[PDB]
């Protein structure tokens, strides 16, 4: 069911069960925002390693009524007690990624739940109760796990053994296998709590009080007041033009939209399809282009409420021209430093350029 056609709606997701839930919403007269909310819940349950109400996301929505494109940003925030050096040790050295990625200092105030509500108020059409309940049943009754979740449990069994996940995912010490039933009693309860009380239970309530508790057990500084501080934001897209099409993508605090657009801009003039898709020339040119944009990413990208991202400069046609001088079939470029997009935009950066280890 990898490809599908439809006259009145379409859903595509990473899990067959979340695809069907989503389809059914549209089939019962729901809109795409109704379907999306139900999908996030279904995926929280069936693909629980990949997203859910303990994380954050960017939900891009083209409004069919107003013809306006908007983004519900539920990205997580650092607690009030995060510090700039909290991933450095006594000696000032970077804590290894597998330690710091399991620590309580790593946990951002989750946003997903507030994202789904914001999106629901604005465009929602079915009651949240109907959207949440199919996931309540998947949690409560359980389902047979797909191979990817199975492999995920096996590959991360060490991380999962040191937490309260031990019992559900590593029962009698062994990883659930492909086809085995996964039942999530405690997850179901939380979704019922949200079904009756809404996000108060999460951000100003018991679910949240429990989150702050487990975060301090694991070493971080998140308080209940971090949870009641949190609200999502709404962003306009970053827009670009490629090959006669307008492209809307995600602005800072994603690096995604700007650098996807920058890569496209840099490679456009090389007319890549003169080369076979599996050709030396294509792979080389893409590799050279990526080096330039990812260097720009490491130097210039962050939360634009705190730092200035030179969006105008990074996509300026003269800047693109300058960087394109470093992209050629003649050789491999060894000068893979960030460029100077500030030259083509008003202002200076308010930050240093700090090299980071590739340990992630």
């Amino acid at each position: 069911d990898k490809v599908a056609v439809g006259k009145d709606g379409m859903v595509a997701t990473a899990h067959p069960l979340a695809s069907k839930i989503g389809a059914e919403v549209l089939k019962k007269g729901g809109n795409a925002i109704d379907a999306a909310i139900a999908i996030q819940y279904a995926l929280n349950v069936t693909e629980p390693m990949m997203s859910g109400i303990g994380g954050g996301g960017f939900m891009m929505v083209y409004d069919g009524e107003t013809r306006e494109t908007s983004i519900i940003n539920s990205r997580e925030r650092a607690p009030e007690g995060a510090k700039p050096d909290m991933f450095l040790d006594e000696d000032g050295k970077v804590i290894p990624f597998s330690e710091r990625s399991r620590h309580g200092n790593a946990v951002g105030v989750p946003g997903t739940l507030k994202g789904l509500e914001a999106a629901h108020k604005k465009w929602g059409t079915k009651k949240l109760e109907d959207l949440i309940s199919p996931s309540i049943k998947l949690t409560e009754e359980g389902f047979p796990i797909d191979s990817v979740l199975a492999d995920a449990i096996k590959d991360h069994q060490d991380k999962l053994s040191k937490t309260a996940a031990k019992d559900i995912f590593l029962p009698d010490g062994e990883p659930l296998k492909e086809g085995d039933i996964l039942v999530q009693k405690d997850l179901a309860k939380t979704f019922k709590l949200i079904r009756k009380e809404g996000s108060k239970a999460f951000y100003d309530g018991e679910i949240g009080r429990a989150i702050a508790d487990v975060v301090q057990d694991f070493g971080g500084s998140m308080t209940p007041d971090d949870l009641s501080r949190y609200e999502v934001t709404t962003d306009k897209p970053i827009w670009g033009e490629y090959h006669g099409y307008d492209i809307a993508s995600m602005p800072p605090p994603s690096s995604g939209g700007v650098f996807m657009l920058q890569v496209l801009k840099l490679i456009d003039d090389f007319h890549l399809s003169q080369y076979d898709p599996k050709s030396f020339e294509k792979y080389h040119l893409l590799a050279e282009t990526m080096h330039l944009s990812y260097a720009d990413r490491a130097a210039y990208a962050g939360d634009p409420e705190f730092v200035d991202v030179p969006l105008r400069g990074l996509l300026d046609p003269d800047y693109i021209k300058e960087r394109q001088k470093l992209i050629s079939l003649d050789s491999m470029n060894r000068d893979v430093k960030e460029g100077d997009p500030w030259k083509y935009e008003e202002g200076e950066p308010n930050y240093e350029i700090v090299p980071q280890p590739e340990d992630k």
Binding site: T163, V214, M250, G256
Partner: protein
Amino acid sequence: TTHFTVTDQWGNVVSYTTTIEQLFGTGILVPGYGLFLNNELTDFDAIPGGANEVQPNKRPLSSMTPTIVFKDEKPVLTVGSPGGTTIIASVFQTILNYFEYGMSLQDAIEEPRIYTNSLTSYRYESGMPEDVRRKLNDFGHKFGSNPVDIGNVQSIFIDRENKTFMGVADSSRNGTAVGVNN
């Protein structure tokens, strides 16, 4: 991360990337509540001073790239992917393959992707030919002896002339596309 997308009969379009960071986030399950907690704050730079330094109340830099492509100001294609910093590579390569090469949507999605953020970090999906990998490496690149899957693009095409939606789920996970009639 996971990425999904939804189109409806009223012409609303959704493209939604969402994550808890690493697989299982931190791994910390909230005792008695069943939900995994993100490790999203390690998307911050570990060494401060820069644009992406940790600060209280700050959002760690993402690479998530939920996208909608438009022709004559109407949406025609949604794209997005999981995969950390590879997400940029997965989305631009799909778009390159669809619009610059004119592949079908599935071909565009399934075509082997490459990723390289630096002179010391290279990945490729299986299907890059052996002879071409060698020649790239001789030229200075560092594509390894082992292929890996990159990303997981879910995408919907809005076909107005045929009055239809086409959805595609990447084979890198067990995703599906399901269409709806009246």
